[PDB]
Amino acid sequence: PQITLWKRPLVTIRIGGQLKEALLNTGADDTVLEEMNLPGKWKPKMIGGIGGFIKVRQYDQIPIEICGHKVIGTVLVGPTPVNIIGRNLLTQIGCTLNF
Amino acid sequence: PQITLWKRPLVTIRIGGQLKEALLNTGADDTVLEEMNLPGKWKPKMIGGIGGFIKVRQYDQIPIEICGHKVIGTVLVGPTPVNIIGRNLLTQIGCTLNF
């Protein structure tokens, strides 16, 4: 699809077969999800943003579907105010910026 | 152009006569540049993201050329970790996400 940028580019994602709204974010290296009790092994990570750093849990090889497109990779979980799909998954779904 | 996302989408911009490198950021509502001088009146604002809130100077109706495309709009200046082009200017240069 084509997504204009008049509004926040929010799309539906599926992680654990369960559905969330997430922001397609070219300014994010990684994918960060709002706090959720995801099962699996994780490692601690600190990620940086506009205001400083936050601590998150890093889960690897997690299947995720983005607007119907299957992906699998690293997902970070922590106290982000919005679910964020970052470049690690945007590349897997063949997402580009065009102008 | 069409820009893939395996690397950070950094482009050259010209603003107030000066060349800088900036990140095309669909996850930002606003454009925020690293500390610099700009001509004209500004107003104090705060903006937020991951890691919290920072204080910025808001300059209105500022011309900026982004990867060869002209925009004129709001530019925030403050302690951002990187120069960010947000949706307010991405829309002006006709940028969409596509997959």
């Binding site: 974010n25 994010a28 990684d30 105010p81 | 809130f53 990187v82």
Partner: peptide, 10 residues
């Protein structure tokens, strides 16, 4: 209301 979701991983 946060609005600028720059994110970087070290």
């Amino acid at each position: 209301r946060p609005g600028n979701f720059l994110q970087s991983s070290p």
